[PDB]
Design a protein around this ligand. Structure first.
Ligand code: L4Y
Length: 260
């Protein structure tokens, strides 16, 4: 269950140290006066997000709901996010990349099975622990309706590359599948796509017209099956994209057979 934490247990987004539980990431969403009577709804949204419990989905450890201060507290993932890892000094072996992909699939299938559409899947929202195991997060608060509203409330002192072309429409599971296709490409390219795009409006129109990440710009070995999977997952028509359970059933035997 979500802990009701107190500031007095701790010494923007910042690393934090709970005086008995240790390292944690804190996002303070609001700091101001008590202009807010969303208290019940803010806490309940936190409880709802905290009920999404899966090994590949981040844990919201606590919430701070105090007089003029509203904070979320999340486990610390010491390797940072997925793009940070892909660009690190030593490369990441193909068997670890394949396991990362499988864990992303499992986490996303869990979320969809609970009726949750992520809407902002991207390497920045894939967090990595020291063992190169991953957790899906929502660091832009696309799923924290109430906390996102509080973040831009009046009395408060405080990405395109992965978006399905229909949204450049009500996000669906298939919107997430498109985002996953581009994450697949980035995992093997070890970088963000579309580096040669000049202008944002150029990129939007190109993607809406059928432009996709440059498969030829992947320099290391990428299995043909993974190339085929990313192309299926970024099909223009969302109804042509598979589901994450359909992806898992194709990818898991391949992972066991050739990547593990
Ligand atoms: C898809 C996942 C479902 C379950 C879940 N539980 N917690 C989060 C989350 O992303 N929590 C961040 C949200 O706000 C932040 C933004 C930036 C940095 C840290 C946080 N913190 C503290 C969180 O708890 C999630 C998403």
């Amino acid at each position: 269950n979500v802990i009701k934490m107190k500031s007095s247990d701790f010494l923007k987004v910042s690393l934090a140290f709970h005086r008995t539980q240790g390292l944690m990431i804190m996002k303070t969403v609001y700091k101001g006066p008590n202009c807010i009577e969303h208290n019940e709804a803010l806490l309940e949204e936190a409880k709802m997000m905290n009920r999404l419990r899966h090994s590949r989905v981040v844990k919201l450890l606590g919430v701070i709901i105090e007089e003029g201060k509203y904070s979320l507290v999340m486990e610390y993932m010491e390797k940072g996010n997925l793009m940070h890892v892909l660009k690190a000094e030593m490369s990441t072996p193909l068997s670890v990349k394949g396991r990362i992909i499988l864990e992303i699939i499992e986490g996303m299938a869990y979320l969809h099975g609970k009726g949750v559409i992520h809407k902002d899947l991207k390497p920045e929202n894939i967090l990595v622990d020291n063992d190169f195991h991953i957790k899906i997060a929502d660091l832009g608060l696309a799923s924290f309706k109430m906390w996102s509203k509080l973040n831009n409330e009046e009395h408060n002192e405080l990405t395109l590359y992965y978006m399905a072309p229909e949204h450049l429409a009500k996000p669906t599971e298939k919107s997430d599948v498109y985002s996953f296709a581009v994450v697949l490409w980035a995992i093997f390219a070890n970088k963000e796509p579309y580096e040669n795009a000049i202008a944002e409006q150029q990129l939007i129109m190109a993607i809406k017209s059928g432009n996709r990440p440059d498969v030829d710009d992947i320099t290391e070995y990428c299995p043909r099956e993974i190339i085929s999977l990313m192309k299926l997952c970024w099909e223009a028509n969302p109804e042509a994209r598979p589901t994450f359970p359909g992806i898992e059933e194709k990818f898991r035997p391949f992972y066991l057979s050739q990547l593990e």
